[PDB]
Amino acid sequence: ITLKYNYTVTLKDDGLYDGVFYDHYNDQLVTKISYNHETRHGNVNFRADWFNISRSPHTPGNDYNFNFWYSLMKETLEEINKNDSTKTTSLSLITGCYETGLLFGSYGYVETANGPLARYHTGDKRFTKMTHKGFPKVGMLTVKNTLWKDVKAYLGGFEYMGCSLAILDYQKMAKGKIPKDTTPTVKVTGNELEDGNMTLECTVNSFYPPDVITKWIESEHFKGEYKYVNGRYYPEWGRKSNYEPGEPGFPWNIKKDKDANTYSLTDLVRTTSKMSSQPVCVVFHDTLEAQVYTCSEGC
Amino acid sequence: ITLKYNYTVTLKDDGLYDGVFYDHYNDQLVTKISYNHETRHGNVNFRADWFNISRSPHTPGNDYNFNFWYSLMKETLEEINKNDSTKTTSLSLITGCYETGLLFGSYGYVETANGPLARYHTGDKRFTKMTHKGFPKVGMLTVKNTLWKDVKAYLGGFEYMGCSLAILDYQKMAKGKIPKDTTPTVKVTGNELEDGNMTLECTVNSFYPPDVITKWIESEHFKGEYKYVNGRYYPEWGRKSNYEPGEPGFPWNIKKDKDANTYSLTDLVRTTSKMSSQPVCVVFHDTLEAQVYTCSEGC
Amino acid sequence: ITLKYNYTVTLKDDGLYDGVFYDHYNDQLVTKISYNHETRHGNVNFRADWFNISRSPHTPGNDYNFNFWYSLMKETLEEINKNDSTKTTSLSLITGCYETGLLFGSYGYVETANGPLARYHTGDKRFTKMTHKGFPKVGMLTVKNTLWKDVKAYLGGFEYMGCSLAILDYQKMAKGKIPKDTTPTVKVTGNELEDGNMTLECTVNSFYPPDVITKWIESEHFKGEYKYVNGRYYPEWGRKSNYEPGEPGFPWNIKKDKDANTYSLTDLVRTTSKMSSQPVCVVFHDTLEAQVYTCSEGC
Amino acid sequence: RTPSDKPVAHVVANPQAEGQLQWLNRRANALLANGVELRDNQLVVPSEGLYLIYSQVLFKGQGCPSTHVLLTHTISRIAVSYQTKVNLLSAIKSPCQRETPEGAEAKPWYEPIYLGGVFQLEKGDRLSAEINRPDYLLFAESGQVYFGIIAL
Amino acid sequence: RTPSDKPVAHVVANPQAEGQLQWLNRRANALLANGVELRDNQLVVPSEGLYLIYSQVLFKGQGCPSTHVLLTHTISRIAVSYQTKVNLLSAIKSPCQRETPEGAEAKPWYEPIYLGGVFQLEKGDRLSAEINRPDYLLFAESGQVYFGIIAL
Amino acid sequence: RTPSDKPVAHVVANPQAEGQLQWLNRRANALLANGVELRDNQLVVPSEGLYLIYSQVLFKGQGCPSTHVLLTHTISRIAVSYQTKVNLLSAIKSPCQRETPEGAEAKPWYEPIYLGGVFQLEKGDRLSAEINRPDYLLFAESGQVYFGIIAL
Ligand SMILES: *[C@@H]1O[C@H](CO)[C@@H](O)[C@H](O)[C@H]1NC(C)=O
Ligand SMILES: *[C@@H]1O[C@H](CO)[C@@H](O)[C@H](O)[C@H]1NC(C)=O
Ligand SMILES: *[C@@H]1O[C@H](CO)[C@@H](O)[C@H](O)[C@H]1NC(C)=O
Ligand SMILES: *[C@@H]1O[C@H](CO)[C@@H](O)[C@H](O)[C@H]1NC(C)=O
Ligand SMILES: *[C@@H]1O[C@H](CO)[C@@H](O)[C@H](O)[C@H]1NC(C)=O
Numbered sequence A, B, C: 001i002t003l004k005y006n007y008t009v010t011l012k013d014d015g016l017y018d019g020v021f022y023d024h025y026n027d028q029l030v031t032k033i034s035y036n037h038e039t040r041h042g043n044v045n046f047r048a049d050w051f052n053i054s055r056s057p058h059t060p061g062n063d064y065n066f067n068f069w070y071s072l073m074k075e076t077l078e079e080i081n082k083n084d085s086t087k088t089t090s091l092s093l094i095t096g097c098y099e100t101g102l103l104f105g106s107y108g109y110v111e112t113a114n115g116p117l118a119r120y121h122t123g124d125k126r127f128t129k130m131t132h133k134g135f136p137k138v139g140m141l142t143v144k145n146t147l148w149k150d151v152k153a154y155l156g157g158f159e160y161m162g163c164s165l166a167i168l169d170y171q172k173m174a175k176g177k178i179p180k181d182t183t184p185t186v187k188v189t190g191n192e193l194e195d196g197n198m199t200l201e202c203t204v205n206s207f208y209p210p211d212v213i214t215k216w217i218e219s220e221h222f223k224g225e226y227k228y229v230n231g232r233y234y235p236e237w238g239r240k241s242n243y244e245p246g247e248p249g250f251p252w253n254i255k256k257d258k259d260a261n262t263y264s265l266t267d268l269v270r271t272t273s274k275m276s277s278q279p280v281c282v283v284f285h286d287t288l289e290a291q292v293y294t295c296s297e298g299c
Numbered sequence D, E, F: 001r002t003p004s005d006k007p008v009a010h011v012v013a014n015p016q017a018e019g020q021l022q023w024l025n026r027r028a029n030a031l032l033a034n035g036v037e038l039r040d041n042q043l044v045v046p047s048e049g050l051y052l053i054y055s056q057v058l059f060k061g062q063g064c065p066s067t068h069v070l071l072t073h074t075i076s077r078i079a080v081s082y083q084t085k086v087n088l089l090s091a092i093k094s095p096c097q098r099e100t101p102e103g104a105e106a107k108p109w110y111e112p113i114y115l116g117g118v119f120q121l122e123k124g125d126r127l128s129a130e131i132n133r134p135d136y137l138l139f140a141e142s143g144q145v146y147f148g149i150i151a152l
């Protein structure tokens, strides 16, 4: 399952700054809020019929602190645009959590129309660069800001525990009103992209909760038994991206397959000779907490 | 609340050695016992109507082991009088405990008509000098004594835990039959005794349970919030006395105010320049577990 | 109480290898199994009427894994006989446990017609020499063996905990159907074997559960009170034998006394001058968890 | 004597505060040392770490009330990084199964509840041990109502 | 932040698995660290040592069944050197004393059970926290059903 | 294998001693090591320190007695510096709410009680885990009745 909050202010054409907020449970829209220019505050434009916000104590109040964020983000966007080498169309606050099979975590980062900017770390209680480029310490991004204390509380708190608690209330109220869980079909293929030696392709077919995570682990680590043991440690051949798996910004080749509620995924891996066991594909999804899949050459 | 036991043998005029024992709960006499010269053992002369000794399992038996103490103290007094440089009129065994607001503790020491002699330490299981002068290792004061084992048990035991348990039984039976709790009025004044720079005076007005303790702490230690946190550590500007606060022998300027059951206190402090924050007065009493009070110059 | 399992394969006269198994609770035969040469598997020849094997979940299944052991022991005996300097008539697997008074433990060792061979240690999960001579690493005695995993499981498991749990089920079903507990009479005598200075003799008279253990401890260690404190440490003047007390192979001078169900014991000790307190005899038996007995010279 | 150096606390219920559940550490065999504070009736952790948290309450009632009565005991954590009571341990118990005194007799009833577990705590966290029916709190004996934590 | 370095685990019951008792560690204030694994619904110890093991289940039932119902909670150890469930801690509780709803009413009942003790464990041991009537499992609230261990 | 070095003990009830509650350490998963002694049916602490003390008893009764029956479980400390039983932990439970078998039937009842907390102890202190109705002691299963302590 997944819970994602998206706050976005845009410079739009010429003039005002627009603001929108989206609350998504899995791929289901739960709430939409936009900044009303006439009134000067947000308005709920959409609310899923199955979500009784009163039964979700951990969903932020004041319409998700929209006015607070819109305003502070507007401020941040203005400052960001002063150094003409940063000027951007819009700014987004991406925060939420997930329970993908055995895996689970939360996130909170700020991205720009130009790409990821800064990630908020619950431990250090501050933002950290997501790119070598760094990020401008302005607006909601610096401790210098007078409202920093609110940022820590609203963003940090939600990411620290609020979200993980809330996601469970959504699940309860969603039980019957959304696509049913659907177990995928997995197959790992050992093709070969010509120039390089070998290539492994893990493909997961039509699974419902759209969140899926994949881990490539050298088979030696399974000491003969191909089961992923929960608390056990495993070295894992990390992927290269500015995003960390779990954050909606992570590049997963997922497409909603043909007329249906289900989704499909294809994950490729460069079997460079650096290794020494040939990875096996470990798939994390709601159905099948965590299964291991093998074979190359083409299985 | 307070529980105090006082055993005293005196050489009286010329002759015999008199013996008395007093049991005081707060300022309420609970039991009086005196040595009967005709019979050669103690007799209960007084017993508070509200105290059913059968409901106080932790109050020492055998009329508070009176015969034992009278005899052993008589022996100790005789030995003490042999070295003519110690000769004293009487000897007293002061033991008891207290629950003054947040503070709590127990004591057991021996004093002479000439002043404090030795204090019994639960840890070391032996007596320790209360004055530079030292104390004669005779009678009930040395491990050499054949009855030492009984001293350890009767005095050490009571001080180690017996008293703290008993005091609670007294409280139960006293509930309705004694002066009601009365909260004091506090004011700290910053007078100045001429020769010295500054002087602070903490005055607590008309409080019932007569036990009150005061702590002077530099304001810096309260980091802006003037509340005394229970388990927190605080350096405290100790007072100078042979007695430790809590022992009835500690000098507190308390007087039972005008025709009433209540009491009043006045504590002064030499604001020498040694410090660096100007102390604040912390008052420990049954009413208001522990409150902080400030201001000087005269408030 | 005692639970002993004895597996034995013998070369008999000329030809085949015979196999027998005995299950003894105290001195009571519970089960007898022997290898049927016609059928080629074991047969239960005897079963105590009071033992319902279904009520003893921890008694090994498959008739105590008899076929397994018979076969593996037969293999081991054959290998042992190849080095003509080891050639033996038979091989035995002795395993079981005990609850003799306060003492308790388990054992599992392999002995030969020539004497103790190897002892199995639950900790190291391997066999260890019981004699300076060492033992041939063949058959069921080496990790090299293809069935080692079964040895660890059947023998190691039983010794690790299986037995201690099972013995309690036997006790329940035996309660009324075997000799009642009988407390012994003890007397320690201080005779003297002429050449040596002094000799101590602890004699325990007619006790029922036949298991009895004796410990000789210098009296100094009892600091005046002659009671053996359960969890307390005591240096103990060990005896010299290839067997450890508790193993049925330990030399105890026990004889079933005259027409009765009870037994008697006589333990002697060389009071060499090495000591410095003269040992006292501590007797461990079901009746009297652990009692101390003194005096020499002849008491 | 070094209690140990480990932050620890074992507070007990104040019998002199009828009708409510107030914790104190100024008694016989109670504890409040090495940093943990008792503030606003809650224990406050002094450092990051794994903690064993536990509590026991003893409910007592004379005869039976009306309809149905529920007794709840629960230990909450209000984290420094998320100021909100979140339950760590909780239990419920139904004393009077609606029996309700027929009209003659009605003996007293006792119902204890124990709670305990290990948790990752932040320096500054506040722990609460609360009940819903303090009017049934039996703190007459001594070691019947307690709340404590020890840093493992 | 170092949870501590000590193998530890505090797993809680999955509410999304009606009818059964499945343990998870992917929640709010739960733990599964420093080596202990959650395999086949059992905690697996990573090293020799003394461990504090504990568990709590909360049973709930609407009105009363027939004859008599028994609730059991028990923690078993299946040792590496003796692959067989052997009970370490166990308790029994009788909710409906045969009362059985006369025919009008029948309120709900709650019955909690706590288990805990210290044990010597081998690297590889498997610990189980099971119940006999998972159909009465009340895991609606939160800290009502848990199972954990901490290496002391 | 080093149990750990920490004084510890987990004793269990002897089933072969009907009518009474006698603790033993000579069983399956029990402990009595590193100094603590089991003397006169009490655990004796070998050193100054903070200790986790705990115990569980399981009461069982066939049908119901007369008037009212009270079950109490309590752990006492008799300190070296104050030789007298003082209660550290205690609980009470009322099984038969006077129901008393009408005259036909009367099923059995089970009632468990857990006790546990952390305490400062002196070398030489004696700890007792006692009950008032040993005639209702159900020590038939195994891990149903235990008493232990571990030095933290
Ligand atoms: C947030 O919403 C904006 C506009 O609705 C969209 O363009 C953007 O991709 C979203 N961000 C994420 C990562 O969901
Ligand atoms: C959610 O909506 C329902 C109506 O369907 C209402 O009765 C309820 O009070 C709301 N929230 C809750 C459960 O408190
Ligand atoms: C922001 O603009 C300043 C000029 O004021 C420039 O020096 C700086 O490098 C810009 N930010 C970065 C590091 O790209
Ligand atoms: C003890 O009692 C004696 C005699 O009544 C008295 O003179 C002495 O001051 C008392 N000491 C204390 C501290 O109560
Ligand atoms: C205290 O006095 C009462 C009479 O008021 C007596 O019955 C009782 O035995 C004594 N102590 C108690 C309450 O046992």
Ligand SMILES: *[C@@H]1O[C@H](CO)[C@@H](O)[C@H](O)[C@H]1NC(C)=O
Binding pocket: B083, B084, B085
């Ligand atoms: C006690 O008397 C002796 C004389 O025998 C004297 O030397 C001693 O100093 C006296 N006590 C003290 C130390 O004041």
Ligand SMILES: *[C@@H]1O[C@H](CO)[C@@H](O)[C@H](O)[C@H]1NC(C)=O
Binding pocket: C006, C007, C008, C020, C022, C092, C094, C248, C249
């Ligand atoms: C085991 O059984 C054999 C054969 O019956 C017997 O001779 C031997 O003494 C027994 N060994 C032990 C230790 O009981």
Ligand SMILES: *[C@@H]1O[C@H](CO)[C@@H](O)[C@H](O)[C@H]1NC(C)=O
Binding pocket: C052, C054, C055
């Ligand atoms: C043991 O034998 C009894 C009768 O002797 C039989 O009824 C029982 O089922 C067997 N074991 C048990 C108690 O299951």
Ligand SMILES: *[C@@H]1O[C@H](CO)[C@@H](O)[C@H](O)[C@H]1NC(C)=O
Binding pocket: C083, C084, C085
């Ligand atoms: C086993 O036989 C070998 C020669 O075959 C001999 O050297 C050895 O000493 C024998 N076993 C032992 C070590 O006693």
